[PDB]
Design a protein around this nucleic acid. Structure first.
Ligand SMILES: [Mg+2]
Ligand SMILES: [Mg+2]
Ligand SMILES: [Mg+2]
Ligand SMILES: [Mg+2]
Ligand SMILES: [Mg+2]
Ligand SMILES: [Mg+2]
Ligand SMILES: [Mg+2]
Ligand SMILES: [Mg+2]
Ligand SMILES: [Mg+2]
Ligand SMILES: [Mg+2]
Ligand SMILES: [Mg+2]
Ligand SMILES: [Mg+2]
Ligand SMILES: [Mg+2]
Ligand SMILES: [Mg+2]
Ligand SMILES: [Mg+2]
Ligand SMILES: [Mg+2]
Ligand SMILES: [Mg+2]
Ligand SMILES: [Mg+2]
Ligand SMILES: [Mg+2]
Ligand SMILES: [Mg+2]
Ligand SMILES: [Mg+2]
Ligand SMILES: [Mg+2]
Ligand SMILES: [Mg+2]
Ligand SMILES: [Mg+2]
Ligand SMILES: [Mg+2]
Ligand SMILES: [Mg+2]
Ligand SMILES: [Mg+2]
Ligand SMILES: [Mg+2]
Ligand SMILES: [Mg+2]
Ligand SMILES: [Mg+2]
Ligand SMILES: [Mg+2]
Ligand SMILES: [Mg+2]
Ligand SMILES: [Mg+2]
Ligand SMILES: [Mg+2]
Ligand SMILES: [Mg+2]
Ligand SMILES: [Mg+2]
Ligand SMILES: [Mg+2]
Ligand SMILES: [Mg+2]
Ligand SMILES: [Mg+2]
Ligand SMILES: [Mg+2]
Ligand SMILES: [Mg+2]
Lengths: 110, 386
RNA sequence: UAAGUCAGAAUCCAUGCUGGAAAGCAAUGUCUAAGUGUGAUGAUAAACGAAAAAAAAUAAAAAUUAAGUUCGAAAGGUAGAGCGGGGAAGAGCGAAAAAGCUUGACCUUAACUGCUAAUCGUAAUUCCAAAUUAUCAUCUACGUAAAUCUUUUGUAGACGACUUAACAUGGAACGGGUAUUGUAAGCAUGAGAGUAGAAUUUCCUACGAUCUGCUGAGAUUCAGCCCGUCUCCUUAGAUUUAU
RNA sequence: AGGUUAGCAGCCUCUGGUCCAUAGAACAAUGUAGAUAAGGGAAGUCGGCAAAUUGGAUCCGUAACUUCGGGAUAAGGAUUGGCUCUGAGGAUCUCAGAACUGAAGCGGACAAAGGUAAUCCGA
RNA sequence: GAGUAGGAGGGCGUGAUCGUUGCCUAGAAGUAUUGGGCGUGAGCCUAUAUGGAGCAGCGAUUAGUGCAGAUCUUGGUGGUAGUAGCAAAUAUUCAAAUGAGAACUUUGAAGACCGAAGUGGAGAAGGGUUCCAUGAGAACAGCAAUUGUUCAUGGGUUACUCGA
RNA sequence: CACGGGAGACCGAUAGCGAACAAGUACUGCGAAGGAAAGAUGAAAAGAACUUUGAAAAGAGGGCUAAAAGACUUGAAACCGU
């Protein structure tokens, strides 16, 4: 196997992922949930959550969380001086009108 | 102190200790009394808990509150897909009890059953039964069967639950002993042989208005407080540590606690042999009519609108029992015949079914069929299709 | 009733039922690389014929008062002899804990014959069999099957444990179904108590809760609902047992 | 300081300050705190302990007893939103009417008495 | 040929003093011993190892002279046990930077709290340098720390009208 | 009792004055008053040069010295690891 830079668009379902989580912990837990989906998907132990994505998660406060997020998973070469993994994953917030048509897909060239 | 007011004890001791079970599918530790009367019959069968619905029947039972009137009763549907037969097993009677003399395997043992021997089929070279295949000599088999004829008291069929017929996660079949009751050892054997590599249907075994036994595992409730477990009366709500305790673990002497006093612990996941459940219907997964009645005269399948909750659609055949039986939906169950054939009233009662409810259980459903919901809302799906 | 017989209880024992790590037993699937591999040292509440198969009856019989029997029993050698003893394969039979019995390539041995015994010095276990198995060392084989952790399921769960999945009938996301709420936003040359202004004098305009239509709408629906999917992720690593 | 309000109450805000209280995951029993239970209604218990009911404002209506002050929110009965209009009180912000409109709801959070009849003490 | 309370006769072992006989940098005292022995027993002698400066016998003299205990004194240590536990005062999250290391430091971006009866701005009592800046190993800040009310070094408190 | 002298069948760091030592000290108490613990590297600092791995503590090499005796003489028991 070779490991290459990858990117994947996916709707994380916070209604589902965060379901029945104690109130004061919802928002934060939504984040951990995203971060784990990053790991499982890209196989990177270094995940980075874009500011905007965070902002959007929290956009409703802690209790009540947006029920769906459209996210881009970026896998990129770790070009740093101190280098542990060859790669890191950026989680990016994509703005959508209706989540209703979406699938998980390889990000498309536009 | 002679205890102040006398009430019965707080659980049946015959049901203890209360720990979980080893037997996951049913284990019948008795098969019905064997009689020479009838040709060899197959003792029990395996099925899965699908859902419940209710029925409207008419009662012919004389002397009853309900004679000649419509009753509505609760019912459980158990999907009963065909079982496959794999082997034969002879048992010898020894002074230390019964013993397995031998097991005669067929040529055909399908992958899923082989799964039984493995924890994961796909990471294994799937080596099971290979030698039984390449070395297979029909002569020897016949020799073994003759052996069993010679030395054996009891004969049982090794049986195969084919899980591939259902939609559930578990595809790994089930491997049962179903004992064979019939007059002469020899004929038992002949019968057993006739069965090998074939499929047995529930009709082969259970009839309608027949009385049933259901063997299986109670739903697990986990670690249980004493109130939930044995149903103690709760202590005064004013009590300092808490009130969900029993008050007195025991008197001074004896210096220890008896096995009799109730305590915390596991509730749920036990094995129960439940007796005398009535068969209201047995039906073929082929009839799209199978859920309807003489009184209904319209197409109905037992599967409720939107499907049995937490179970699925029932495509296979099934038995429909009066009342409820042990365990959560999807628990496999072993339906065994009554130890002694039941002669009492409820058992003689001929059952006249009028309504079988196909109404959705996911909510409070008022529709018996899609066609109904659609007529009501003026959406024809046959129209959208066209 | 003493022998001998019948009836006979919510009793007793069973049957049924739940446990069943009884440091019990059986049947069956696969594997145990390489040899009926060898060497040394060892342990086993007890090897020196530590010998031995009728069945039943004790007020039976024609008749026998004791396993107070019977069988085996030569040199802990060699060379011959060979009464006799033991048994491959395969084929037979044999199951209460299958312990073995038959046949049988062949392997072996007693009388008898010759050597050899003595200096193990008037005793000091007569150290050798059989069934088991430990340890160390080594020769050949560098393989085979399976499990576990890092995953998965929620029929299970305090944690362990348990049911179940393993490149996809899995997980994700999505489509449809079923269901809950109760008719979303936005429009309306539709209705609306009544007010104000323009307009022309039986109207226009503005404001207006609310009604009505578009709309049984909109929203949500597995995280332990159901059916389905073009798409996305999982094919790697470590560990354990037989070694 | 602003909004609500009788209010320096409560609830929400601006200025200024702060997120400091070891953390992660699971979600059993038992517990600490918080709520809700069909039918009955103290049968529970030494005991209504605890809980529940009541609660603002406007309009009605208001006993015995009495030291004539009181009792007194006695007891009890109603109303409360929104919207569209109408009238009255004043200088060189209160009060009252009418009509229309809703799942007959409207002190919608917050705030906020449960009554009655007797007996004993102490004014 | 018994023996508690009790009494008597002999003996073991420890300081110091007057004598007497001696031993030790060619290794005294002390210490450890599954080395070898001696006493019925107090106790003894030796061997080996360690140790690195004082010791020992015999006759007398003298005694702060022998410990298993007294909820005994002081000191040192266990098991419990990686256990009970670290849960009041609603709350945190993302990226960058710094660093060996960041849930706990700094900037920014979000979300909440105290809600002018404050988690705000200043005083009296009490504290006394805790204030400011730079730096930082251990300890302390009951997790952590690159941070500090902690450590180190330097520097800060001006009055006719304020108060005494 | 104070400053001096000399001495002893005294005591010998849990003993001897409470204090062998920054001891009537640290510390406590509004106060009157209470009041400890704490002595021995070596003949000489010769107190561990230098190499190496570490962010650092430190380890491994290497060295002083009669000996590491290295925060220090001897180094018992309880307790703990191999
Ligand atoms: Mg880094
Ligand atoms: Mg860096
Ligand atoms: Mg009883
Ligand atoms: Mg049985
Ligand atoms: Mg129950
Ligand atoms: Mg407790
Ligand atoms: Mg009888
Ligand atoms: Mg009895
Ligand atoms: Mg209009
Ligand atoms: Mg969906
Ligand atoms: Mg979850
Ligand atoms: Mg699905
Ligand atoms: Mg926590
Ligand atoms: Mg109630
Ligand atoms: Mg009532
Ligand atoms: Mg009621
Ligand atoms: Mg009360
Ligand atoms: Mg009055
Ligand atoms: Mg009133
Ligand atoms: Mg009154
Ligand atoms: Mg009104
Ligand atoms: Mg009015
Ligand atoms: Mg009205
Ligand atoms: Mg109300
Ligand atoms: Mg009262
Ligand atoms: Mg008073
Ligand atoms: Mg002395
Ligand atoms: Mg020397
Ligand atoms: Mg002596
Ligand atoms: Mg020496
Ligand atoms: Mg003397
Ligand atoms: Mg002593
Ligand atoms: Mg002592
Ligand atoms: Mg302790
Ligand atoms: Mg606590
Ligand atoms: Mg604070
Ligand atoms: Mg302040
Ligand atoms: Mg200040
Ligand atoms: Mg060193
Ligand atoms: Mg030395
Ligand atoms: Mg030890």
């Amino acid at each position: 196997v070779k490991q290459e830079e990858k990117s994947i668009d996916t709707t994380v379902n916070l209604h589902k992922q965060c379901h029945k989580i104690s109130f004061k912990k919802k928002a934060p837990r939504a984040i951990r949930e995203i971060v784990a989906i990053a790991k499982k998907t890209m196989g990177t132990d270094d995940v980075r959550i874009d500011t905007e994505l965070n902002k959007f998660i929290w956009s409703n406060g802690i209790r009540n969380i947006p029920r769906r997020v459209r996210v881009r998973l970026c896998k990129r070469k770790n070009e740093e001086e101190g280098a542990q993994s060859q790669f890191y994953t950026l989680v990016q917030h994509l703005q959508v009108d209706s989540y209703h048509g979406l699938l998980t897909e390889k990000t498309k060239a536009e | 102190s002679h205890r102040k007011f006398e009430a019965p004890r707080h659980g049946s001791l015959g049901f203890r200790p209360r720990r979980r079970t080893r037997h996951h599918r049913g284990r019948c530790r008795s098969f019905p009394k064997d009689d020479p009367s009838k040709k060899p019959h197959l003792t029990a069968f395996t099925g899965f808990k699908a859902g419940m619905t209710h029925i409207l029947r008419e009662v012919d039972r004389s002397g009853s509150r309900h004679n000649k009137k419509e009753v509505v009763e609760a019912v459980t549907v158990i999907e009963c897909p065909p079982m496959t037969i794999v082997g034969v097993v002879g048992y010898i009677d020894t002074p230390r009890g019964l013993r397995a003399l031998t097991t005669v395997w067929a040529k055909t043992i399908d992958n899923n059953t082989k799964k039984r021997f493995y924890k994961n089929w796909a990471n294994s070279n799937k080596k099971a039964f290979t030698h039984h295949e390449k070395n297979f000599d029909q002569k020897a088999q016949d020799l073994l069967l003759k052996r069993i004829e010679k030395y054996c008291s009891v004969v049982r069929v090794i049986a195969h639950t084919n899980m591939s017929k259902l939609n559930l996660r578990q595809k790994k079949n089930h491997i049962l002993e179903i004992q064979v009751n019939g007059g002469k050892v020899a004929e038992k054997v002949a019968f057993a042989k006739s069965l090998l590599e074939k499929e047995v249907k529930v009709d082969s075994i259970f009839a309608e208005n027949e009385m049933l036994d259901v063997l299986g595992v109670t739903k697990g409730k986990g670690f249980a407080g004493v109130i939930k477990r044995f149903g103690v009366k709760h202590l005064q709500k004013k009590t300092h540590r808490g009130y969900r305790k029993v008050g007195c673990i025991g008197a001074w002497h004896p210096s220890r606690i008896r096995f009799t006093v109730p305590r915390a612990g596991q509730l749920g996941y036990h094995h129960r042999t439940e007796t005398n459940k009535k068969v209201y219907r047995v039906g073929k997964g082929d009839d799209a009519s199978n859920a309807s009645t003489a009184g209904d005269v319209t197409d109905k399948a037992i599967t409720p609108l939107g499907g049995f909750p937490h179970y699925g659609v029932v495509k296979n055949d099934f038995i429909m029992i009066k009342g409820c039986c042990v365990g959560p939906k999807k628990r496999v169950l072993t339906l065994r015949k009554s130890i002694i054939p039941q002669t009492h009233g409820a058992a003689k009662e001929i059952i006249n079914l009028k309504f079988i409810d196909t109404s959705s259980k996911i909510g409070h459903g008022r529709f018996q069929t899609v066609e109904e919901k659609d007529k009501f809302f003026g959406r024809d799906r046959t129209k959208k299709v066209e």
